[PDB]
Amino acid sequence: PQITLWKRPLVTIKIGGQLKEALLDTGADDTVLEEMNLPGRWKPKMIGGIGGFIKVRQYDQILIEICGHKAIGTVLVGPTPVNVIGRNLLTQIGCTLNF
Amino acid sequence: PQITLWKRPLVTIKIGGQLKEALLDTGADDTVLEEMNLPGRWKPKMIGGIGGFIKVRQYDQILIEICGHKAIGTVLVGPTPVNVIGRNLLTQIGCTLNF
Ligand SMILES: CC(C)CN(C[C@@H](O)[C@H](Cc1ccccc1)NC(=O)O[C@H]1CO[C@H]2OCC[C@H]21)S(=O)(=O)c1ccc2ncsc2c1
């Protein structure tokens, strides 16, 4: 689809078999989701945003469907203010900016 | 133009007589620019993201040219690590997400 930006670009995602809402975020290198339970192993990591750094659990090679498009990649889980879909998965679903 | 997301979507902007690099950021409600000494009145604001909040100065009706496309709107100035072009201006240059 073509998504205009007068509203937040929020979409439904499926991860771990659960549905969630997430923000298509071209300013995010990585995908960061709010606290949740995810199966499989993970490694602790740090990520920095506009306000500083937070601790996150890094899950590798996670299946995640974004607005009907499938991706498999790294997902960070931690105290983010909003579920954000970052460029590591936006590229997988073929997302571009156009003007 | 069409901008793929393999790398950060950095573009050249012109604001306050200065050229700068900034992110086309669909995850940003507002536009947030690195510290710069703009003239005119402003009002304080707090914006939150990953890591917490930062204090910024809100300037209204600021002229900003984004990759050759003129716009005018609210610009927030503060200790952000990156120049961020938010949705308030992306809509003005006709920017969409497409996949
Ligand atoms: C978190 C989202 C919802 C909101 N942000 C926008 C998002 O694109 C930020 C932009 C950014 C900030 C600092 C350095 C690089 C890029 N990216 C981000 O945090 O990415 C994380 C995850 O991947 C990593 O790569 C990049 C950094 C890591 S924001 O900056 O906090 C914001 C902007 C306007 C605004 N107006 C009212 S609130 C408000 C809040």
Instruction: Kindly list the distances between the CA atom of residue B99 and the CA atoms of A26, A95, B11, B39, B71, in Å, as whole numbers in the listed order.
Output: 13, 5, 21, 40, 25
Separation of alpha carbons B5 and A86, rounded Å = 9
Distances from the Cα of B83 to the Cαs of A30, A66, B33, B41, B51, in angstroms? 18, 27, 4, 21, 17
Report the alpha-carbon distance of residue A77 to residue A36 in Å, rounded.
Answer: 7
Helix boundaries (H) for B1-99: 87-90
DSSP letter string over chain A?
Answer: -EE-SSS--EEEEEETTEEEEEEE-TT-SS-EE-S----S--EEEEEE-SS-EEEEEEEEEEEEEETTEEEEEEEEES--SS-EE-HHHHTTTT-EEE-
Of A1, A24, A52, the CB nearest to B52: A52
A79: β partners? none
Resolution (A): 1.9
- CA-to-CA distance for B78 and A8, rounded, in angstroms? 23
What residues have CB less than 8 Å from A36, skipping those under 6 apart? A15, A16, A18, A20, A77
Please count the other Cβ atoms lying within 10 Å of the Cβ belonging to residue B39.
Answer: 7
Distance from CA of A58 to the nearest CA of B (A): 15
**Residue B90 backbone dihedrals phi, psi, to 5 degrees:** -60, -40
| β-pairing verdict for B31-33 and B69-77 | parallel
A68 interfacial to chain B (CB closer than 8 Å): no
SS3 of residue B48 by DSSP: strand
Nearest residue in chain A measured CA to CA from B82: A50
Residue A88: phi and psi, rounded to 5, are -60, -30
Cβ atoms < 10 Å from Cβ of A74? 16
Whether B60 lines ligand 1, by a CB cut-off of 6 Å, is no
Q: Is there a contact between B8 and A29 (Cβ–Cβ < 8 Å)? A: yes
Whether B28 lines ligand 1, by a CB cut-off of 6 Å, is yes
From the list A8, A90, A99, the residue facing B94 with the nearest CB is: A99
User: In chain B, what residues touch A31 (CB-CB under 8 Å)?
Assistant: none
Nearest atom in ligand 1 to the alpha carbon of residue A30 is 23
Rounded to whole angstroms, how far apart are CA atoms A52 and B70?
Answer: 32
Compute the Cα dihedral for A97, B19, B30, A30 and give only its sign: positive
Q: What is the largest CA-CA distance in chain B?
A: 41
Task: Check if A30 has its Cβ closer than 6 Å to any atom of ligand 1.
Answer: yes
Amino acid letter at A99? F
B46 interaction partners in chain A (CB closer than 8 Å): none
Closest CA to B63 of B15, B17, B23: B15
